[PDB]
Amino acid sequence: QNCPTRRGLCVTSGLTACRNHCRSCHRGDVGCVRCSNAQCTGFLGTTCTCINPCPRC
Numbered sequence: 715q716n717c718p719t720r721r722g723l724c725v726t727s728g729l730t731a732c733r734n735h736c737r738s739c740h741r742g743d744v745g746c747v748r749c750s751n752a753q754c755t756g757f758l759g760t761t762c763t764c765i766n767p768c769p770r771c
Contacts, residue, residue, distance in 0.1 A: 715741070715746075716739060716746075717738075717739040717740050717741055717746035717771065718740065718741060719740065719741040720735050720740065720762065721761055721762050722760070722761075722762070723735055723762040724754035724755075724756070724759050724760060724761055724762045725760045729752070729753070729754050731762075732752045732753070732754055732762035732763075733751065733752040735752070735762065735764075736748070736749045736750075736751065736752035736762070736763075736764035736765065737749065737750070737751075737752075739771035740764075742768065745770065746770070746771055747768045747769065747770055747771055748768065748769065748770075748771040749764035749765055749766065749767065749768040750765055750766065750767055750768075751764070751765035752764050752765055753765065
């Protein structure tokens, strides 16, 4: 799709990839959205998360 789902970007691609995916159109919880910034999360930083706002795209 033009807005796929990715969350493993902090496992090897690094925070830079998590920040580029959150600033691009990606799959949200109910539809595709894009956000302003990002950070890595999880017990070992093995997850990617975006920062609001997150308007439609």
